[model samples]
Target: SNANNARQARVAQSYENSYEVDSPAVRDSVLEAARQYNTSVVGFPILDPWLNRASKNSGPYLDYLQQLNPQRAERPVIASISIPTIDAHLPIYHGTDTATLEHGLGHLYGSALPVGGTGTHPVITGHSGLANATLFDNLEDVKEHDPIYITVQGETLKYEVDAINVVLPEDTKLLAPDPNKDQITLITCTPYAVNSHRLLVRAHRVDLDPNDPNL
Candidate 1:
């Protein structure tokens, strides 16, 4: 998997290395900047989910969401994913099977829905890369014990990657409606094939508040 090489690249060359949020101050600053950009950018309007369809093309909406309420945008803006070659239709959030891949990043606009709410486990899927660098391109380099943190307003939720599994698309049980667990299931399009199945990274929540206002 060349995970070592990828990890080195991430730590030494990725934006995460130079553009880190290692301190509370830094985190707050980043949130503030994200907020300002969300607003200062053009073509934006305040909107609730009921009246709009969130999509990858949602720049203004994302800005408004990021600025008006950073806490509301709690869900981590994990990584960016795209299919430059396809430029396909219907869904612009490409590279994975998890529904959140579409709604969370674009529609939900960084908002984190309850992990186990609505009888559905919160899922985030991404890609490993295609022909060139893309979102989730370094996912394989993420160790099983690495941290997956999401900062909501003022609270930070943490999860540790616990396991990894490669599964077939027909494995519906993995995508069950509600598993009654606070978990993160990462899905990815198997490299090199359209229906080449999926690669899954499972993690469990270690920190979050049931009644926290941040979420």
Candidate 2:
């Protein structure tokens, strides 16, 4: 039976270990809330620009949304994404509220968290063509087979661009997980400064190069 997974409670150790003496409460609380979110939300979902349902900062999720830049230590960014092809390196914030999207990439709620797993599909989104920041502005420039590196605490989950397309907000499988493979999707607005449709760069997990000096 494929029943074991239903009872399993997963905690991302690599993500958990990053918490030093500063305050484990932030780390623990965030993980618990993420875990609760994973359990509460079920099934695949389409991408919502407004993200009205899952990206709640209410009682079940992190109540305190920091207005500070996500990269700051006190602000708490769970991970960072590096897309060398576009020369894009951005922090992955936990929530996708107004407080986060203005500063960095916000992990789309209802999808998998940034922590790596076989059946996880983490959808990360950032603003494009914004006058203030260069973040994801050049996301459309990302080509197929380009390397995507996601740094989650101690481990760097390696992936390569497998698909690229421009789709409308009503697209299907925008937040679906491939149960056998780990995946992540990068999303941004389309047509440079126009900002109408959505741009999707989905990548599949691949072997990590252990000899990497940065590792």
Candidate 3:
């Protein structure tokens, strides 16, 4: 089925292309393309945090766990914790891209949300076809109020998906960070072979304990 998704794959590949070239002649153009691609299909806000602190260059997605809970000093980290049977990248389809999860953001495996650090909400990303095919497809099976759990270090963090929607590319504001509360937004392309839209799953942090400092 995904083999037939040539147009969508082209769009996805082109988006990554802009991210690869950073010359002044194409810098603005590249960014604009990235914005359009991300807004249209990735359907998430792009952050430019460093892939590693030692490097000056930053990645579009930020690392929440590293930034917020360094030294394993806090509980309820937003990164996804791995379960014995289910790998963190289970739903992500890897065939489209050649990069490894760790090479990108492997530390998020089996943690409680795939976050960057404390105070800063991390937005983890993955593909929906080929490698981890059924990743986000289960969103439709997840009813409102279903509990999504994340464990960090030794503590567990839980969130509930209060709402879910399938929306057009222009409706990307849902990914915005709330100033008052913490949130997690899981997204993927919608309508399978014709991914002209996105499926957005919104979850709210319902539980956290400040004293536990395992992760």
TM-score for each predicted model, relative to the true structure:
0.43, 0.73, 0.48
Candidate 3 on 18-100: residue-level lDDT in tens?
35543554534433442343233222334311121212223422232223222222221223432222233332211112243
Tens-place lDDT per residue, model 2, 53-152, is 5645565345323221222234467789898877888998866666688899987766777666677787898888777888888888888888888875
What lDDT score is found at residue 19 in candidate 2? Answer: 47
Candidate 1 per-residue lDDT, tens place, 91-203, comes to 22311224444343332333223222223233454444444434545555566776565444344555677877776765635544333556656556565556366666666
Q: Enumerate residue pairs that collide in model 2.
A: none
**Rank ordering of all candidates by lDDT, starting from the highest:** 2, 1, 3
What lDDT is obtained when candidate 3 is compared to the true structure? 0.42
Tell me the deviation in Å of residue 145 in model 2.
1.1
The Cα error of candidate 1 at residue 119, in Å, is: 6.9
- For all candidates, the clash counts are 2, 0, 29
Model 2 TM-score?
0.73
